[PDB]
Specification:
Chains B, D: One of its GO terms (cellular component) is outer membrane-bounded periplasmic space. The complex is a heterotetramer, with two copies of chain A and two copies of chain B. By secondary structure, chain A is an all-alpha fold. Helix content of chain A is 71%, strand content 0%. In chain A, helix 2 runs antiparallel to helix 3. In chain B, the strands form three sheets. A six-stranded mixed sheet of chain B has the order 3-4-5-8-9-12, with helices on both faces. In chain B, strands 2, 6, 7, 10 and 11 form a five-stranded antiparallel sheet that branches. In chain B, helix 12 links the parallel strand 8 and strand 9. The chains are: A mainly alpha, B alpha/beta.
Chain lengths: 259, 539, 259, 539
């Protein structure tokens, strides 16, 4: 196996929480900047895996200034994690009504529609988000997952193109290359070790690659390998990676087949 | 209004947004997965015409063929909120309707003559649109004649028919120049909504208790009693009220209980699981299923049976939603017998969501409050795995009207969702009535073959039946429509008198003497009381 | 592999933090009960892996009431996690001076002396803690680790006795039985699956058993298997298990051999 | 005090605890891993006697053999804080010392006669204890004679010797009944501490700046200058002060620089890494190693060389700690030449910790402040991996006194930690002096063979040497001790006069004329200035 030390709360992270915890108890603040900090702290809480406490700070942000697309972004994500895709859609619509260039709303809404059984609607969003940056290999990967449900044959030809016409620079294209059959899973992991630098980097590489390997095996109907790989993806505590969140949701839908 | 001084209606600032919000929810979150493609927007067009011109009366065929060129564009209009075809098609026919009522007044002055052999077709729901103004004027000649004739047959002078049908037609013109931009918006969203399923709706923004409770009673056959619960609807804390009355009835040594859910059209699903629980120990009542694919079981958690005595459930074609859950559970557990007409078939849950976002007062404060939408989110399944939808609960004992094919039921609503089955839940039957049923039926059939009220019902059926061709073809001849009313009045007086001599009551010299508040007999309830006792006897 | 879903912050945990966060901002409190709650919250923070923020609440507890042995317990543990065994010893002495029946001070001081190169002094403490409850198999296991450094042969005979004279009921004795050579690692894990009930139970079983298997392989000088097993032990986020804390310290001393 | 009205000393309430706290830290956190077993507590006993009776003068052998039965018990006393043997053994000998000073006064009255052939042994550090009171009285007869004689040889009348030696002995009795319970406690903890290593200590609770800076100077040989930095100690911000002076000297075209660290006994390790940095670019200065097994490298981070000119480092047997770090680094990088005597060998770091816990004022508020302990936590290693300890920095050029075996050095302290080596650090040598060294030495040896001050030094050595048997055996004969002083005074006057005629100064008629503030020459500094120039010549 390739394993990292699971990531742990850094002292910077813990120090900032304690400061904020008190900058927010001292009533010396605009509404507009009390709201900016409550958002800043939810992102910190979120990055630690403390989604309930972040949902709390984000709701307190929008009760003060409902103008904020960034906050609807997270509210929608949590709603996607929770299984409530209807409400998720509502939140991301809000995001792109308040700011229509907020691209990452397209990815999150697209994923949300993916888990919510609406593939064709997911494709529209995931392709908008692809076309915002065709060099980012994960934008190709998410679109693949959404296509491979109706037409695997097409999904593969399209990924192949997305890869061919990209500059093939960023790590993620190695995951893409294995989906395409160019490189074995053996080689995929050789290149992972090679590309990783420190343990924080190794955890990030493993969070991603375990989720995509996870999704891959689940295609073949290998629930056992999928399950192992989702668990190992989550075992890096890269709490705010989409692959983390969605390896947990995947795991949750597999702890609802056996019941 | 004397001319085209009808205001030209325009789409309001808020509406483009409100349309986009409606489309978002319908296209993504509806139990029904549909594409808002060209085929769908074409079907939204035809529905929209049927909402403007119900009877195909007001528009020229050329009005329709012109706008119809542009009907695959409606999905774009809705998604963007640019509803130009909806507003154009409404504005014209805002004119056409004006110019039909200004024509209908002119024709009211001409001489009235009700001695022809002309008929009048009440159902132009699928007629070709008038080809020219001569045919338009002809359909509206028929219409003022039908309006005049239906009034004449209430003993009105030619003079007071013109005075009342002027009042009417002139008010039709005032209605018409008092409609607002939201009225047209509402009707565009309604064409959309109703093309998905018959329970989906848009709901416009607002413009500038113990009466519905359980009544209990007792009814005897010789020395033996039967408790009856009239349940008007599944109002919140119903199960508390029937628990009071189930104690009143348990003590008065009743041989059998009847739950009466006729024309009980639904209510809180929770009151359906809690009431099911009074009669079966524990177990699942209903499998609910969501838009995304996922099933859920509501169960009865308190393992005690508040009444184990013989139970009977009386339903009709208007028993619906929660009623069908309850009736379906009792049938499936063999806890209670089902009597009456097959039920409606409402196998679906709709949810209200607001089109209002928290940042609206903030950014667009000129706007008014926005509407809400109502749409299907869930289906119901029985514990045996079948669906309530478009099949309904079918009684163990079917009264005569239930063997007759009726035109009322979810099955007959437009784009009602189809019938489905999932896997059955795990439950243990509280009993089994397949044993008793053929005997209950031997007795039932014997009894109603004699009863004259059930003879009267089964004669009514032969009539309703034999006169279903001419069903929507009304005579415009005063003589034939005077004679038709006299033969209806005469057959009614004879029924009422056949009854009063059975009962030792004085006969009526004429139909007009009958008290305004006369109570008909309830032959269906009266025969079910017998079924209930027959069941008690057999256990 | 036997893998659990890594444990995640429960909603009870997140709700209580938010309540406390405000019961402690409302100045309606004794010194004695403000100090009791600051301790209660450090245990919660600690149970989430947020040791810096707990160290913070525990220091705020002893600045208010320095009478509290329970708080010195945690301060000492963190000091053991940090590599500072001198200060750890000082803290645990404080604990047993303020309350000499505070047995778990013996385990923590014993472990601290173990990592601090003082085996004979560790044995005295670990044997005091054994004799407080000879049925708890982990008390035997910690004493074994401390003995097996000077005399493996004796450490084994003593574990064997500790096991023979115990009632052999609680799960932990299966780990003990594998150290003794009675059962293969194959069987050890068969019995793990069998004994585990839900995922929270499975994570706890894996946190423990991976640390002891970890320590075991490290004996043979198998740094690679040790490393994998420590990482997998930590991957269950059972943050407040001694095996978690000390699989991290173990991992830290192995990321100081390669440097 | 006329009798045994000396207070009986008792252990205070706090002390049991304070003992337990000291034992905890020494037994667990000391660089030295020892067992507080029977062998250790026996050695703590012998040290404790040597602290009560330094010269084996006050106690009977029977006093010692009685308490000695109980010496393997001290580890228990310390761990528990019940220090009964320490308090008993002190109390007796609180009496014994009283009754030696009351005897010594009696004997002062007897007639004085300094004409015998008796000697006096100044070192009874390892003598057998007196066997009986006759032998006790004999050792104290010797002692008042030695005290009388040493005073007589400062020209005192038999009358004023009795007046001064009464003052002394009577004050010895007052000291004795003014000692406190903490005094005995302190000395028990000291016996413990000093049996671990010579730098470990107990420190009793408190009872009811630019003078030490760098001085710079210049010294010439013909037309060529050499800068000299006298560094009194590694005081914080030393490296700032020498940076000022390194600029003053760089500009005055000096051929060479000397750092003078003679009798510089240490200071802030950080000032040793920062000063090392002025002379070598970057690299590790010192490997520190902790009690638990773990090594650490202090480095110089600013990669610039404030002075690349030829460097020389002057050290003696009292250069220690931080000085030895600096001198060792310059030697190891071949950045600078080392001249003088091998250094002390202080290869260890001690830390202060308080015996005070935050809950003390709370729970035991009657108590006083408690002490602190000082103990070894770390060792030092050179960048080549060897240890400073008990080897010290050995000079490239060793002055004559350094080839002579002295009795001053860490090596001679009791239970000084042994010498160790770890692996070398990774560093690149800033240069290499193995090339120049044999030539610098050819010249050095030639020069000092002529110099009369170095002739005087090398004569002093032959003397100090040949008279090391009789080293601690002083004559008690006034004649022989009058003649000894005259021959010392005479040899001194001859040296001073040999010097004054070399220098063109007036000769002294007698030793007494010499100014009180006469400055001796510094032959070691003066010869190193030459070494420094020879080095400059060769690069």
């Amino acid at each position: 196996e390739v394993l990292a030390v699971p990531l742990q709360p850094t002292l910077q992270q813990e120090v900032i929480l304690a400061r904020m915890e008190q900058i927010l108890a001292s009533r010396a603040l605009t509404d507009d900047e009390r709201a900016q900090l409550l958002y800043e702290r939810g992102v910190l809480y979120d990055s630690l895996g403390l989604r309930a406490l972040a949902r709390n700070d984000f709701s307190q942000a929008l009760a003060i200034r409902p103008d904020m697309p960034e906050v609807f972004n997270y509210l929608g994500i949590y709603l996607t994690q929770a299984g409530n895709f209807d409400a998720a859609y509502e939140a991301f619509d809000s995001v792109l009504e308040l700011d229509p260039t907020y691209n990452y709303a397209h990815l999150n809404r697209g994923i949300a529609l993916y888990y919510g059984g609406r593939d064709k609607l997911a494709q529209d969003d995931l392709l908008a988000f692809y076309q915002d940056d065709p060099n980012d290999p994960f934008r190709s990967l998410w679109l693949y997952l959404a296509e491979q449900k109706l037409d695997e044959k097409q999904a593969k030809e399209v990924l192949k193109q997305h890869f061919e016409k990209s500059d093939k620079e960023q790590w993620g294209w190695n995951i893409v290359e294995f989906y395409l059959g160019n490189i074995s899973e053996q080689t995929l992991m050789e290149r992972l070790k090679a590309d990783a630098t420190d343990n924080t980097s190794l955890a990030e590489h493993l969070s991603e690659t375990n989720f995509y390997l996870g999704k891959y095996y689940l295609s073949l109907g290998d629930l056992d390998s999928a399950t192992a790989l989702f668990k190992l993806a989550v075992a890096n505590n890269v709490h705010n990676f989409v692959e983390h969140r969605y390896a947990l949701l995947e795991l949750s839908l597999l702890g609802q087949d056996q019941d | 209004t004397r001319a085209d001084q009808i205001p030209v209606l325009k789409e309001e600032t808020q509406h483009a947004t409100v349309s986009e919000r409606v489309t978002s929810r319908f296209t993504r979150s509806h139990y029904r997965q549909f594409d808002l493609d060209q085929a769908f927007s074409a079907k939204i067009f035809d529905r929209y015409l049927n909402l403007l011109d119900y009877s195909h009366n007001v528009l020229l065929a050329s009005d329709v063929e012109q706008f119809a060129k542009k009907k695959t564009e409606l999905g774009d209009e809705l998604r963007s909120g640019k509803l130009d075809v909806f507003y154009d098609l409404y504005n014209l026919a805002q004119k056409r309707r004006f110019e039909r009522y200004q024509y209908a007044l002119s024709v009211l002055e001409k001489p009235m003559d009700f001695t022809g052999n002309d008929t009048y077709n009440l159902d132009r729901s699928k007629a070709p649109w008038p080809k020219n103004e001569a045919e338009l004027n002809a359909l509206w000649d028929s219409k003022v004649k039908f309006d005049e004739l239906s009034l004449k047959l209430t003993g009105k002078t030619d003079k007071e028919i013109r005075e009342t049908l002027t009042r009417r037609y002139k008010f039709a013109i005032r209605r018409l120049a008092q409609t607002n931009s939201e009225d047209v918006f509402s009707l565009a969203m309604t064409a959309f909504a109703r093309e998905i399923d018959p329970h989906t709706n848009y709901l416009s923004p607002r413009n500038t208790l113990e009466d519905r409770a359980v009544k209990m009673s007792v009814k005897t056959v010789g020395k033996e009693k039967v408790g009856v619960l009239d349940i008007p609807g599944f109002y919140v804390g119903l199960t508390d009220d029937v628990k009071v009355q189930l104690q009143k009835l348990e003590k008065q040594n009743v041989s059998s209980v009847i739950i009466d859910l006729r024309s009980n059209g639904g209510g809180a699903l929770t009151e359906a699981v809690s009431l099911s629980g009074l009669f079966i120990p524990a177990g699942p009542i209903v499998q609910v299923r969501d838009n995304n694919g996922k099933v859920r079981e509501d169960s009865d958690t308190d393992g005690q049976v508040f009444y184990k005595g013989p139970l009977v459930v009386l339903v009709d074609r208007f028993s619906a939603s929660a009623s069908e859950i309850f009736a379906a559970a009792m049938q499936d557990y063999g806890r209670a017998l089902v009597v009456g007409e097959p039920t409606f078939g409402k196998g679906t849950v709709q949810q209200y969501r607001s089109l209002n976002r928290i940042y609206d007062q903030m950014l667009r404060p000129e706007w008014p409050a926005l509407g809400s939408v109502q749409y299907t989110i869930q289906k119901f399944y029985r514990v045996n795995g079948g669906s309530t939808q478009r099949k309904g609960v079918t009684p163990d004992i079917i009264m005569p009207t239930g063997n007759e094919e009726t035109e009322t039921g979810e099955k007959f609503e437009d784009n009602a969702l189809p019938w489905d089955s999932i896997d059955a839940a795990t439950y243990v039957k509280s009993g089994d009535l397949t044993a008793f049923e053929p005997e209950l039926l031997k007795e039932h059939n014997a009894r109603i073959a004699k009863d004259p009220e059930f003879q009267n019902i089964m004669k009514d059926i032969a009539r309703f039946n034999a006169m279903k061709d001419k069903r929507n073809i009304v005579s415009l001849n005063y003589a034939v429509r005077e004679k038709e009313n006299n033969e209806d009045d005469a057959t009614r007086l004879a029924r009422l008198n056949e009854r009063f001599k059975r009962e030792g009551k004085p006969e009526l010299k004429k139909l007009d003497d009958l008290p305004k508040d006369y109570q008909e007999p309830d032959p269906y309830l009266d025969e079910t009381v017998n079924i209930a006792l027959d069941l008690a006897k057999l256990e």
